């Protein structure tokens, strides 16, 4: 998270960390007691998922849970076209109990509004290139479909929306993939991709447009 700040501890209790040999590589979002939503490009044959975290040392985070998962379902149109439909559902090996620091979030059914101020959270790289110690948060503004398409055509697809790109250089960065973009108390997007290096003036990040997938999500979780 470029040019954000430390989140209020446990203010984003749906945040999930995807870790590989105790190092984070992606986030996800608790959407159901047995299901985490993440970016399809974060796919692994099995996962260690951290819930209830602030620092990434679970040993030092009372109420945290490190849970195993092996089943994940990538959206069937993922990467047709390339970079599009970038969502997957991970089923946790066991249901998780909700608590003060672990909670599901609802998904927006309405598409994003240009100018809407929304919140992204994650443990990815900082402006200074280092990894932060605790969960970072930053506010970014949803960009018009016209500005999204001008910048990213021919890779823009309406499974995507853009946000950020201000003078303030606020943006997601590497390790923030799959984490939440929250608008008005709902989950509106997942961190997906952007121009590299991250934070460039006038180049917004791209987020999975979750309002297009509310039926696929409900069906996968219920089947």
């Amino acid at each position: 998270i470029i040019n954000g700040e430390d989140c209020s501890p446990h203010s984003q209790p749906w945040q999930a960390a995807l870790v590989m040999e105790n190092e984070l590589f992606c986030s996800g979002v608790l959407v159901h007691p047995q299901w985490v939503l993440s970016a399809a490009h974060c796919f692994q044959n099995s996962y260690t998922i951290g819930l209830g975290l602030h620092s990434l040392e679970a040993d030092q985070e009372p109420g945290s849970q490190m849970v195993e998962a092996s089943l994940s379902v990538r959206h069937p149109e993922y990467n047709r076209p390339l970079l599009a439909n970038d969502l997957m559902l991970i089923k946790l090996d066991e249901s998780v109990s909700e608590s003060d620091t672990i909670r599901s979030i609802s998904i927006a059914s309405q598409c994003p509004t240009a100018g809407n101020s929304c919140l992204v959270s994650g443990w990815g790289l900082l402006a200074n290139g280092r990894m932060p110690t605790v969960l970072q948060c930053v506010n970014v503004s949803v960009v018009s479909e016209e500005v999204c398409s001008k910048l990213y055509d021919p890779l823009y697809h309406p499974s995507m929306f853009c946000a950020g790109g201000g003078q303030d250089q606020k943006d997601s960065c590497n390790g923030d993939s799959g984490g939440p973009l929250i608008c008005n108390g709902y989950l509106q997007g997942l961190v997906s991709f952007g121009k590299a290096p991250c934070g460039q003036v006038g180049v917004p990040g791209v987020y999975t447009n979750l309002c297009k997938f509310t039926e696929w999500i409900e069906k996968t979780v219920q089947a």
Partner: protein, 164 residues
Amino acid sequence: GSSVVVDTNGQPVSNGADAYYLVPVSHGHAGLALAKIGNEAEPRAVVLDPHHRPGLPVRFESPLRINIIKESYFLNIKFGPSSSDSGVWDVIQQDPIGLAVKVTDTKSLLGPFKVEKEGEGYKIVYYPERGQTGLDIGLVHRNDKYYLAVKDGEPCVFKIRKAT
């Protein structure tokens, strides 16, 4: 796709943030460098120089906001720092090499390369259309130099050493 690209220490190769030496698994004495093809100007072709090691290090870049590289990702490969796009690899039809690896100063959002497991390490594979089939990167010998170039079926196999 499953499989994560790893370095000689078994750790996942980072997305752009760290630089790595491409070390030939039976030519460890040789390093990546820049050479001319004949048309004077600056040297812009990528060669394996047998006398100068460990060579120019690379970064592997995906536009995905993940901090590791998977074998299924399309990448840019580049010389130099993250902040610069002066040393970005591309494959250019050029007599008498064939399809030569050359440095350029522009970059597509999706680069044309994948890094794929081969033998004891990895090969670089070129996908000019970003479709299902790609062409292995090998060596072509001319003018006393070994140029990186498309050599389908005859890849150059590297291990990936963190410049650390």
